[PDB]
Design a protein around this nucleic acid. Structure first.
Lengths: 216, 196, 86, 129, 108, 25, 105, 101
RNA sequence: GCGAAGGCCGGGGGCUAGAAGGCGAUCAGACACCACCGUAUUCCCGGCCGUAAACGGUGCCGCCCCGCGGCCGGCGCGCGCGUCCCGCCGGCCGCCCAGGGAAACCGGGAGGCUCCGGGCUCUGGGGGGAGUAUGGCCGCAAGGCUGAAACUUGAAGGCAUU
């Protein structure tokens, strides 16, 4: 089958003008092809998670139609986490569709440090809040000895994100795990958008290293 | 400040606009006629066309710039601009999904957008948001600036203004580059840009 | 000043350093697809000829949704010198 | 009626910064408001501030650089022992390392770290992160 | 109830666009020979061919009467208009708005 | 209006119950 | 092969998909499989797995569709494997509906 | 929930409003809720109007036109098709269908 | 202190409509709807009652708050000049960008709030039992206001989708 770039970014990506996935997320690139996430971490691929296989029914004249919906927490412990959801007639099609979506929306986690600094980022940089549906999760920085103390499901998301230590606080119908994992992901997704006092020196914006201007 | 252009612009009516004025466009309008028509200041239009031209010149691949117009009156003009310049065109209906559906028949990933009418070309502006396309817009006096980087205030309705504005932009982008020299006249005639 | 967080020894971390939107000085997120980058060329004394060096800015989608960019552009460029300050 | 003038002020400051507006205007000028702004200038959160006199309350125009996340007040001003400026930082500030809590103390209006150096405490005036 | 279906219509429209010259307006029988031509199209079965040719007769009469499938035989005229530049330009050849800017057109 | 008709039955029972109480007062 | 694979305990989903792939590798335009019966339930269930476009009616299907039915006999009882394969490109016959237009001249 | 933000009544800054009557139902409806149409129509049937006018001995006597206002209750109007049940999107339009006769 | 209606208690008055009541069709029954007649009432005056899906189902004072329209009042600016143009202030509204919410939808807030703290009052804490019992007060009554428990039960509810 091989790979044929259906995306201009994909053509540049195989061409090697862009090295690393971070530079795409710097230039706020929409990512449509899963092949760009797999190609950025090819060896041993990366960990994925089967979560909440579900059986929704839409009523029709004869009766309800059963379609399986699954949610996947693709992530590796480097600060990249993606949660995505896919619904299909069979479980096998749904897990593959959700996995593709989860890989597509891999996002950078700021990670960061507590009061102590040594050289290993071990916690979320600042308390992080995300609301999905009715659940709001608060990801608070933790001491290095303390681990990920969280709901069994959101614990995995923060582990597949390389956040070794976190303080969690989930409020709402957390039992609705699809919303619960989304809130943790939403908090993590906008960790770079929050501006810290360290990002206060203005710099660059030169166009030369932009991956959008890059014409192969 | 081109004196020759302002006499032509006065006949083209790029100085005139709709009676509704948005707060964002208030700066450009000099005043109004008693009947309620609004008089865009002509030199702001010049210092806008040239500003857009400076941004447009940065796009090294000419066809990366994509122009869209469902407005039949301006359809000849966007194409004429594209032929004299080398920008790509999306005339007539937008065939929604062009910007974000990879398998769309006209699927493009432009680096810049030229929307003839912010209201008439509404779908393209929302789609440009999903795929990081900054957009330039020809606008009237009542123009919402939602998802518009830069906007050029022209009559954006009369055929003569709509065609002339594109001629001014095309000449400006080429004049900034090489093509027609900055001082000599363009061989291309403003009239062939306007649709009848 | 090393933009970025730094460990006690040094070593600025923060591999993705976001682009601060110029108008609001607000970092642009990873999935901020609405956020955009526009470059305005520089014109020579000789007939406004392009010198191949262009000032560029990052503009978040939120400012764009409001419509603030059309006036921010004029202000930013004016100070840069790009636009006729008037 | 208008009771905590600081809450009015900070709410307008955060709101104006959210839309990005460079200058924000505060109707009543107060010693406590000016001191919070002086602490914000000291940490650089506010670019510049000036007070226009009306022979009345006095009005304040604040130049915002665009670097302020959130600024809030705590009502009523709760007396904080020097021991408890540990706990208040945990629930009111983003992270132990960064962010500022400002407490009125007999020494003056000072940030949590400054009063932690002096090992003294006062009533919270508000918090700027 | 004889409504030509899309299958008949799609094939018929392509055939006029490909060979407008071969078809004639009031002759279904000539169109049937053109449509039956091995080169023009491979229509399996007599009925589809008979109907597709009937649709071309109506379509041909329509595309001869007016430009109602693009006609390249008519595109040249459109292209000529596309390159048409009026020799005397109507628009190259409020009152105090120019005075306001600083440079006064029609000064006084 | 079942709620209205229910409060009318309660009001009737409460009238009869108070009247019976009075007979044995 | 399907009846043998199913009797040998190869999983239903994979097994139908293995056959589906063989028609796709062969290039056949459409294959379906409708195993039906006590499939992993006390009640009867029907599992239809299909890949590609398959015509269902008209005279063409008689001379353009391939149908085969086997009765598998697992421990539960009778199950009914089915395969339907449609190829427009078989012998010298054309699906009647498609008019073929290929060139300007 | 709130099917209509106007709550079915053009009542603003009022608290209470006057009462009116369904022409056929004779129901009591608040004035704001009432359908309220104004109908101007010929006193004689329009089909017979020309002959009546020609027969009218008076020179240039225009046929008198009746001027009346018809007010119906919601229930009354839906049965008489004065107004039609409309889709949730169509309810928000406030302009007369097909352009007072 | 005020408080729609119905009710009440003394006085009036009395058309209409009209609980009760009577009839006439209908229907298995109809004693209900539809017709016909008709008392209290409706109306007035002095009291009482103290409740309404009394709703905008959104307490009040305070600030910030994004544009676009209408309407009412007062005022101001400008000009051909007219109940014109443009504001301002207080209202009455529609549409909405942000934001918010479980949504419907709010958006002059139901925003500025899990990054939660302007002030002050009121109420709520799964569904019944039960607004019942009993005790208090208030009322001429009708009833109002306050107000349980024993016990039962795994659901009740909201908004949307099919």
């Amino acid at each position: 089958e091989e790979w044929h770039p259906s995306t201009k970014l994909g053509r540049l990506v195989k061409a090697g003008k862009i090295e690393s996935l971070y530079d795409i997320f710097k230039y706020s690139l929409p990512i449509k092809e899963t092949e760009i996430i797999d190609y950025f971490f090819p060896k041993s691929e990366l960990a994925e998670e089967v979560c909440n296989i579900m059986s929704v029914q839409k009523q029709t004249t004869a009766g309800q139609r059963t379609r399986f919906r699954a949610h996947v927490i693709v992530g590796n412990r480097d600060g990249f986490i993606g949660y995505g959801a896919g619904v299909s007639k069979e479980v096998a099609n749904a897990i593959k569709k959700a996995a593709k979506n989860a890989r597509l929306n891999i996002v950078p986690v700021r990670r960061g440090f507590w009061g102590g600094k040594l050289g290993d980022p071990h916690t979320v940089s600042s308390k992080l809040s995300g609301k999905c549906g009715s659940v709001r999760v608060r990801l608070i920085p933790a001491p290095r000895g303390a681990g990920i103390v969280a709901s069994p499901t959101v614990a995995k998301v923060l582990e597949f994100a390389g956040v070794s230590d976190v303080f969690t606080r989930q409020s709402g119908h957390s039992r609705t795990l699809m919303n619960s994992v989304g809130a943790v992901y939403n908090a993590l997704k906008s960790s770079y958008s929050i501006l810290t006092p360290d990002l206060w020196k203005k710099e660059q914006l030169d166009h030369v290293q932009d991956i959008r201007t890059m014409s192969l | 400040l081109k004196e020759a252009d302002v006499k032509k612009m006065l006949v083209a009516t790029t100085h005139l606009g709709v009676r509704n004025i948005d707060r964002r466009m208030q700066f450009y309008i000099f005043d109004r006629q008693k009947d309620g028509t609004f008089v865009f200041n002509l030199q702001k239009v010049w210092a806008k066309i040239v500003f857009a031209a400076r941004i447009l010149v940065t796009i090294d691949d000419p066809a990366e710039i994509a122009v869209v117009a469902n407005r039949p009156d301006a359809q000849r003009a966007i194409l004429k601009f594209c032929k004299y310049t080398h920008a790509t065109a999306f005339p007539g209906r937008f065939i929604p999904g062009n910007f974000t559906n990879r398998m769309n028949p006209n699927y493009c990933e432009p680096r810049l957008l030229l929307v003839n009418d912010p209201v008439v070309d509404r779908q393209a502006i929302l789609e440009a948001s999903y795929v990081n396309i900054p957009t330039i817009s020809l606008c009237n006096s009542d123009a919402n600036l939602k998802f518009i980087d830069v906007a050029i205030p022209c009559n954006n309705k009369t055929p003569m203004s709509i065609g002339l504005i594109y001629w001014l932009l095309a000449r400006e982008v080429l004049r900034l580059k090489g093509s027609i020299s900055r001082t000599e006249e363009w061989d291309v005639k403003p009239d062939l840009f306007v649709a009848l | 000043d090393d933009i970025g967080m730094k460990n006690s020894s040094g070593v600025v971390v923060d591999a993705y350093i976001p682009r601060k939107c110029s108008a609001t000085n607000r970092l642009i997120g990873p999935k901020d697809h609405a956020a955009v980058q526009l470059s305005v060329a520089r014109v020579n004394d000789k007939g406004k000829m392009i010198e191949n060096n262009y000032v560029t800015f990052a503009f978040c989608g939120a400012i764009r949704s409001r419509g603030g960019v059309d006036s921010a552009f004029m202000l930013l460029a004016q100070e840069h010198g790009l636009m006729e300050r008037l | 009626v208008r009771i905590n003038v600081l809450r009015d002020a900070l709410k307008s400051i955060c709101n104006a910064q959210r839309i990005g507006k460079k200058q924000v205007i505060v109707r009543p000028s107060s010693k406590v408001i000016i001191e919070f702004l002086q602490l914000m200038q000291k940490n650089g959160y506010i670019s510049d501030f000036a007070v226009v006199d009306n022979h009345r309350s006095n009005r304040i125009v604040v130049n915002l650089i665009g670097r302020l996340n959130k600024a809030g007040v705590i009502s009523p001003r709760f007396d904080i022992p020097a021991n408890d400026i540990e706990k208040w930082v945990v629930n009111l500030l983003p992270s132990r390392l960064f962010g500022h809590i400002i407490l009125t103390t007999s020494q003056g209006i000072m940030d949590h770290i400054e009063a932690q150096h002096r090992q003294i405490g006062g009533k919270v005036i508000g918090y700027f992160y | 109830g004889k409504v030509r279906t899309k299958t008949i219509k799609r094939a018929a429209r392509k055939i006029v666009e490909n060979n407008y010259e071969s078809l004639k307006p009031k002759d279904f029988q000539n169109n049937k020979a053109i449509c039956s031509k091995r080169n023009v199209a491979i229509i399996p079965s007599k009925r589809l061919r008979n109907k597709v040719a009937g649709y071309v007769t109506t379509l041909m009469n329509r595309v001869v009467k007016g430009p109602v499938i693009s006609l390249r035989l008519q595109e040249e005229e459109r292209e000529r208009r596309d390159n048409y530049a009026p020799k005397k330009s109507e628009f190259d050849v409020t009152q105090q708005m120019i005075d306001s800017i600083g440079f006064k057109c029609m000064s006084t | 209006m079942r709620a209205k008709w229910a409060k009318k039955r309660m009001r009737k029972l409460k009238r009869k119950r108070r009247h019976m109480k009075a007979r044995s007062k | 092969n399907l009846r043998a694979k199913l009797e040998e305990a190869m999983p239903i989903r994979r097994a139908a998909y293995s056959i589906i792939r063989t028609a796709m590798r062969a290039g056949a335009a459409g294959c379906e499989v409708i195993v039906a019966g006590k499939l992993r339930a006390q009640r009867a269930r029907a599992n239809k797995f299909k890949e590609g476009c398959l015509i269902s009616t008209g005279h063409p299907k008689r001379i353009f569709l391939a149908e085969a039915t086997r009765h598998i006999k697992m421990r539960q009882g009778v199950i009914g494997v089915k395969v339907r394969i449609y190829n427009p490109n078989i012998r010298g016959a054309v699906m009647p509906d498609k008019i073929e237009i290929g060139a300007f001249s | 929930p709130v099917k209509r933000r106007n709550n079915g009544r053009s009542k603003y800054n009022c608290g209470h409003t006057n009462i009116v009557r369904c022409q056929n139902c004779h129901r009591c409806v608040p004035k704001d809720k009432v359908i309220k149409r104004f109908t101007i129509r010929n006193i004689v049937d329009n089909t017979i109007a020309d002959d009546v006018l020609n027969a009218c001995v008076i020179q240039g006597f225009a046929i008198p036109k009746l001027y009346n206002k018809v007010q119906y209750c919601v229930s009354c109007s839906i049965h008489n098709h004065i107004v039609r049940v409309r889709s949730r999107e169509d309810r928000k339009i406030r302009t007369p269908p097909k352009r007072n006769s």
